[PDB]
Amino acid sequence: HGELQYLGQIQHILRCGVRKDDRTGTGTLSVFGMQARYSLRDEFPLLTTKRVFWKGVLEELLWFIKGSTNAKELSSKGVKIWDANGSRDFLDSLGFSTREEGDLGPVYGFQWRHFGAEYRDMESDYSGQGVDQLQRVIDTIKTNPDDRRIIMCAWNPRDLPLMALPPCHALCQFYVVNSELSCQLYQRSGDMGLGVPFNIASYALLTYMIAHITGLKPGDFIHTLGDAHIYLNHIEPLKIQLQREPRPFPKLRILRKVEKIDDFKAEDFQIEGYNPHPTIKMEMAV
Amino acid sequence: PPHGELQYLGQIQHILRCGVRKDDRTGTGTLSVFGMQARYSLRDEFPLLTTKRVFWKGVLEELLWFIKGSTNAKELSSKGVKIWDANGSRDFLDSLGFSTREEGDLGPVYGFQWRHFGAEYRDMESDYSGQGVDQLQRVIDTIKTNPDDRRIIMCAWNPRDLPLMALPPCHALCQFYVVNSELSCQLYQRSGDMGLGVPFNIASYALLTYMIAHITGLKPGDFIHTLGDAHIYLNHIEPLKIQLQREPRPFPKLRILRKVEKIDDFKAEDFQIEGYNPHPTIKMEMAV
Ligand SMILES: Cc1ccc2nc(N)[nH]c(=O)c2c1Sc1ccncc1
Ligand SMILES: Cc1ccc2nc(N)[nH]c(=O)c2c1Sc1ccncc1
Ligand SMILES: O=c1ccn([C@H]2C[C@H](O)[C@@H](COP(=O)(O)O)O2)c(=O)[nH]1
Ligand SMILES: O=c1ccn([C@H]2C[C@H](O)[C@@H](COP(=O)(O)O)O2)c(=O)[nH]1
């Protein structure tokens, strides 16, 4: 079972991790550098030891793809994961006093579709400015699948001062061999309790989507971690989760033929056979 | 638990055993695996591989060249370090449409992205003083003032500058980490020529970690090497089979011979490698 690599990482950190203070003031147990491999072949790695917020995964990805940097746009679909980092108080603490609530700055959506464009605000029109990395990845996969440069990068040093949160998913790399598409994510910072399960699902989903558009089979998702950490108030909750036996991963079916990445809608996806254990409350450190 | 040269030899064995055939840009052909990670301790030793002699002069000189912000291959070539000459040659540059550039102008690669990320590239000899983001000095400053930061990153991958690069960076980014007065480094290498590139590259980022540790008053911890497309070129199979027959020897030490306050002030004569006793050099063709 693929899920055993996630649970193995949690237990590796519980026992070898080092105490480390953090930006949030909460404290963490932390390890630097880990890697896990999840198969996408006839299965989809949505964790079963706790229910992962699939609606959030799907809507957050559609939002990235659209190029949005407005947390209220996501919040109005019922997904509140970016609300704390886009709030008035949070934005004021970084010194963005005149920024509208929900304006996260030039984060993923903007960097993926408009890398290098000049950010103004979340409502501006950026059509045709900057580099559309997402569409370039798709185009390269179709014409030169052997390419070792199929990368999408959200980390933009010049824009960091304007971001409410510098991207945790600094970059991802695609790989093709034998008509099978794989993806590796470099995650610089991983909240192992709250974020990583959700982050795994997102990139697996992105890989299914791209595979669908390019006529390829999904292969592997490789998850690479920089600072992999467990917040101190997640230790007891993760201990509960580790008592649970994984159930089989579900499958993902895409329900119509879709030609452009921008045409996918929430209704085109169906998770089949997902039957997780209950959610576990893990407070978000902000 | 293996923390030295055996991880590297193990990756080689794994690609020879389970690697898939994959064609590549250079027309040589490879055996390839996607996604690998190894961890090299830097604690009282320096990971210069011993089953073949690694080109230490080239490692050192290339790192000093990156640090000073250069993207001119002639500056290495002038020192007898030829590792960038095929990608900086007149013919290679012209083959990519760069007929007006001077030979050796690799474009806005590491030196430029590390010291001036976001500046508008003109040519290799332009004055970029005060332009773009000095990522390297920022890394060093964050390490001194906020060692717990999970954002201590230097990124060479610049999508806007890609069309101008002779070769897009293989070392897309690196991340630093501090705990218990120890500095570690992780490298994301999108593409690793396991025979020729990877030993030399491990040594590069181990050396950068020692230099930064020295400037910040920290001890070197680990170097974590992460690979995207880890590949053995088909014409490196014979040389690698010879290498896998040889027993690893203890790693050397690295000594910094003087107290140096700024990263820019390091010179080649400040570094001494001690007790390096490798098996001979093995020649391996460079795929262009
Ligand atoms: C998107 C986001 C924004 C800020 C975050 N802050 C912390 N501390 N942890 C996080 O995982 C986190 C995340 S991912 C997340 C958050 C909530 N539910 C599932 C996944
Ligand atoms: C710097 C560089 C430039 C282009 C390259 N092309 C191939 N194919 N492999 C490589 O390792 C490579 C390298 S690293 C290298 C080259 C020669 N000696 C040791 C290390
Ligand atoms: O998709 C996401 C977004 C954020 N985080 C986490 C990691 C950190 O705990 C925190 C970000 O804080 P810094 O690393 O930037 O300090 O949120 C994730 O795990 N996944
Ligand atoms: O420091 C370096 C520079 C280049 N290469 C390799 C990897 C590839 O074999 C080749 C670059 O080719 P592409 O991945 O860009 O196609 O050189 C390395 O391994 N290390």
UniProtKB/Swiss-Prot annotation, chain A:
| SUPFAM superfamilies the record matches | Thymidylate synthase/dCMP hydroxymethylase
Name the GO terms of the biological process aspect: DNA biosynthetic process; dTMP biosynthetic process; dTTP biosynthetic process; methylation; negative regulation of translation; tetrahydrofolate interconversion
Q: Which Pfam families match?
A: Thymidylat_synt
Q: What class of enzyme is it?
A: transferase
Family affiliation: Belongs to the thymidylate synthase family.
Show the InterPro entries listed in the entry: Thymidate_synth/dCMP_Mease, Thymidate_synth/dCMP_Mease_dom, Thymidate_synth/dCMP_Mease_sf, Thymidylate_synthase, Thymidylate_synthase_AS
Q: Which GO terms describe its cellular component?
A: cytoplasm; cytosol; mitochondrial inner membrane; mitochondrial matrix; mitochondrion; nucleus
Q: Where does dUMP bind?
A: 23, 148-149, 168-169, 188-191, 199, 229-231
The EC code for this enzyme is 2.1.1.45
Q: Gene behind this chain? A: TYMS
Specify which residues bind (6R)-5,10-methylene-5,6,7,8-tetrahydrofolate according to the UniProt entry for this protein. Answer: 191, 285
UniProt-recorded name of the protein: Thymidylate synthase
- Protein location: Nucleus; Cytoplasm; Mitochondrion; Mitochondrion matrix
Give UniProt keywords alphabetically: Cytoplasm, Disease variant, Dyskeratosis congenita, Isopeptide bond, Membrane, Methyltransferase, Mitochondrion, Mitochondrion inner membrane, Nucleotide biosynthesis, Nucleus, Phosphoprotein, Transferase, Ubl conjugation
- Per its database record, what is this protein's job? Catalyzes the reductive methylation of 2'-deoxyuridine 5'-monophosphate (dUMP) to thymidine 5'-monophosphate (dTMP), using the cosubstrate, 5,10- methylenetetrahydrofolate (CH2H4folate) as a 1-carbon donor and reductant and contributes to the de novo mitochondrial thymidylate biosynthesis pathway.
